[PDB]
Amino acid sequence: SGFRKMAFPSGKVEGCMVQVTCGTTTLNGLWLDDVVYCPRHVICTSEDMLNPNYEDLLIRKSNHNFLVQAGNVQLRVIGHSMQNCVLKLKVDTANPKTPKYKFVRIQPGQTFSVLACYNGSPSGVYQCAMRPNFTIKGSFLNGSCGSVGFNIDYDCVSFCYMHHMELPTGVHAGTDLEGNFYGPFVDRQTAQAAGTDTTITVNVLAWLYAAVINGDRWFLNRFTTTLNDFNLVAMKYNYEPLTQDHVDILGPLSAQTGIAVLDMCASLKELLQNGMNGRTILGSALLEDEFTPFDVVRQCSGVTF
Amino acid sequence: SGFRKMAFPSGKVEGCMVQVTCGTTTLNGLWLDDVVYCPRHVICTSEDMLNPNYEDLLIRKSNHNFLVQAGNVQLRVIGHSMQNCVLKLKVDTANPKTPKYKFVRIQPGQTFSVLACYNGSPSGVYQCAMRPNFTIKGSFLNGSCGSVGFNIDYDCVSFCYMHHMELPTGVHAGTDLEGNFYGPFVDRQTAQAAGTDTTITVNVLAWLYAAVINGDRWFLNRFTTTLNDFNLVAMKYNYEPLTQDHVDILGPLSAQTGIAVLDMCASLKELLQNGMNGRTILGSALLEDEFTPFDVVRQCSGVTF
Numbered sequence: 001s002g003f004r005k006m007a008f009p010s011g012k013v014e015g016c017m018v019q020v021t022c023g024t025t026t027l028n029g030l031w032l033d034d035v036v037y038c039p040r041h042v043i044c045t046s047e048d049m050l051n052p053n054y055e056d057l058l059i060r061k062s063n064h065n066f067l068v069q070a071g072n073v074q075l076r077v078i079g080h081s082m083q084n085c086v087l088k089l090k091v092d093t094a095n096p097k098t099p100k101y102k103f104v105r106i107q108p109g110q111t112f113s114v115l116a117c118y119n120g121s122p123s124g125v126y127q128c129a130m131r132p133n134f135t136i137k138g139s140f141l142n143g144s145c146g147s148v149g150f151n152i153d154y155d156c157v158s159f160c161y162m163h164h165m166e167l168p169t170g171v172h173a174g175t176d177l178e179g180n181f182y183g184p185f186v187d188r189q190t191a192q193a194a195g196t197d198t199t200i201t202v203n204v205l206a207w208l209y210a211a212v213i214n215g216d217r218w219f220l221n222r223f224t225t226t227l228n229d230f231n232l233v234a235m236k237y238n239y240e241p242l243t244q245d246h247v248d249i250l251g252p253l254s255a256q257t258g259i260a261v262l263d264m265c266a267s268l269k270e271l272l273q274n275g276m277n278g279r280t281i282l283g284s285a286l287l288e289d290e291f292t293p294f295d296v297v298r299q300c301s302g303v304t305f
Numbered sequence: 306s307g308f309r310k311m312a313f314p315s316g317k318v319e320g321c322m323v324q325v326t327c328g329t330t331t332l333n334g335l336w337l338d339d340v341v342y343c344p345r346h347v348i349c350t351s352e353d354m355l356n357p358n359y360e361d362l363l364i365r366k367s368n369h370n371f372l373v374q375a376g377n378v379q380l381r382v383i384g385h386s387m388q389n390c391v392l393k394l395k396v397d398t399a400n401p402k403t404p405k406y407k408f409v410r411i412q413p414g415q416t417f418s419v420l421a422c423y424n425g426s427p428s429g430v431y432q433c434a435m436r437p438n439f440t441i442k443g444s445f446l447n448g449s450c451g452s453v454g455f456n457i458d459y460d461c462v463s464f465c466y467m468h469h470m471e472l473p474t475g476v477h478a479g480t481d482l483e484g485n486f487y488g489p490f491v492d493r494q495t496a497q498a499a500g501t502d503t504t505i506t507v508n509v510l511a512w513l514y515a516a517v518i519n520g521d522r523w524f525l526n527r528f529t530t531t532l533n534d535f536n537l538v539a540m541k542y543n544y545e546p547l548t549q550d551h552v553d554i555l556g557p558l559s560a561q562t563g564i565a566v567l568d569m570c571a572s573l574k575e576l577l578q579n580g581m582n583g584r585t586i587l588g589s590a591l592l593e594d595e596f597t598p599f600d601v602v603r604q605c606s607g608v609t610f
């Protein structure tokens with residue numbers, strides 16, 4: 001037992017990280033088969049940053065201007081192309097460490113692990129959620145651009161995120177691995193509004209189930225509610241509306257604990273209306289929304305890769 | 306910017322995990338050079354668990370009884386020896402994936418990453434602290450025994466923890482890699498007192514510095530304190546006493562922020578006496594004590610491996 005914010009083991013991803021330098025800018029790239037993926041703003045300079053014309057900037061570049069280094073190994077670049085906000089550098093060697101992999105565009109509210117890297121070297125790994133407003137609350141310093149987020153199922157790495165930028169509010173924005181930003185963001189140095197954010201209701205409920213499984217049970221009450229009544233409360237507290245699809249994905253946790261989903265909603269309603277009264281749940285003094293139902297089941301069942 | 310509970314990248318450790326089977330018990334082992342390390346309780350059965358005579362149990366075993374498997378490849382066991390609470394199985398092949406490594410016995414209050422494994426396969430990675438009472442608050446299910454904790458400095462993995470057991474209270478106990486338990490614990494199925502835990506004061510201060518660096522500064526106040534006055538408050542709230550050695554190791558964070566260590570102690574004093582008033586710090590509604598001053602500097606400066 002116990003319940004931790006757990007990341008995926010990062011070894012399969014560590015073997016794909018490279019350094020990419022173009023001009024004076026160095027950031028990280030992802031080396032899969034014979035292609036290196038990285039943020040296209042590696043080709044900018046400080047004068048460019050307010051509104052780069054990336055097509056014009058890339059036209060001034062040739063293959064030999066992109067310096068790609070995998071540990072101490074220098075890679076030979078034999079082609080380059082821009083796809084949305086990512087650059088695809090074709091290299092003459094396939095990465096011998098390429099895992100089985102897929103590219104996925106995740107939905108808001110899903111979670112993934114981030115391997116934070118600088119100069120192509122891994123620094124740390126942590127778990128985080130794609131917020132409903134398509135930002136992430138990461139830990140990224142200058143030089144972390146090109147760090148990737150991912151999930152692992154059996155032997156297959158699903159890459160879902162590449163880091164591009166920090167907004168002036170201090171939250172983080174990036175793309176899928178086809179270079180499409182999550183959310184409204186663009187890769188330029190402008191103030192950019194992120195949506196109203198909300199709390200991921202189905203994840204809070206999953207975590208409350210995780211709490212019960214671990215014996216944190218003080219918040220269970222004598223009440224139930226309806227989906228309609230619960231969602232009136234969710235709206236008041238800026239929680240995402242709960243749908244029957246969410247109730248369905250919580251099915252396995254309801255079965256394990258024997259607590260019906262709408263009964264757990266009534267416990268959550270009471271926590272929202274009354275607070276925690278200085279108590280804690282799974283070591284947290286607020287309602288945690290960065291565990292999906294799948295995460296809770298995995299961590300509670302011991303799934304390996 | 307941003308501050309996350311970050312684990313070390315786990316790849317160097319993933320390549321050392323094997324499965325060890327003795328009789329009907331399977332758990333994890335650590336394969337370094339030509340030695341496999343695992344918890345000695347792999348040799349027990351359920352009749353044994355209340356107070357195993359490990360010497361007598363091991364005498365009934367020979368090399369060929371220890372089944373050691375690395376993914377698909379079987380290893381050949383050519384010697385065995387019990388050191389404290391760990392078994393050392395000599396194998397005829399040096400692990401080709403052996404990183405540069407050291408065995409370290411850590412101090413309470415220090416942190417490390419855990420690679421949770423089942424059947425020799427990695428499941429997840431998370432960061433945690435050795436509590437002042439020599440337990441850890443992990444996430445471990447049946448079969449996780451032999452999972453290890455570690456730190457990395459440049460290219461060198463310092464192994465500091467091997468997981469052995471879950472106490473009846475749901476916290477976790479284990480050994481250094483010489484098989485010596487942290488704390489008073491023994492490897493038998495008995496209720497065992499862990500004794501009073503305290504909050505790691507120097508770590509809370511480090512995290513308050515992390516907060517200021519990231520722009521959470523609402524808790525800074527107009528007050529200062531003395532080491533003696535602060536420690537009266539520390540004692541009242543079950544915080545470890547702060548020593549000048551602790552103040553010394555906070556020096557770099559004090560210099561970076563311009564906030565004297567005793568001024569930050571007066572902010573913590575006010576938080577302990579008045580609580581957080583429904584506010585958060587770095588996403589948390591309580592005072593976090595699982596980041597060491599070294600952890601904060603590393604994460605805020607982007608140290609890689």
Ligand SMILES: O=C1N[C@@H](CC2CCCCC2)C(=O)N1c1cncc(F)c1
Pocket residue numbers: 041049140141142143144145164165166167186187188189306
């Ligand atoms: O390293 C960089 N470089 C810019 C890229 C940014 C891309 C769009 C044009 C303007 C520059 C950035 O946002 N960061 C960064 C990311 N995460 C955390 C940080 F602290 C900084």
Ligand SMILES: O=C1N[C@@H](CC2CCCCC2)C(=O)N1c1cncc(F)c1
Pocket residue numbers: 001346354445446447448449450469470471472491492493494
């Ligand atoms: O898998 C086992 N096996 C016993 C070993 C234990 C060793 C000492 C004699 C009594 C048995 C155990 O404590 N766990 C476990 C660990 N962490 C989280 C869990 F949920 C269970």
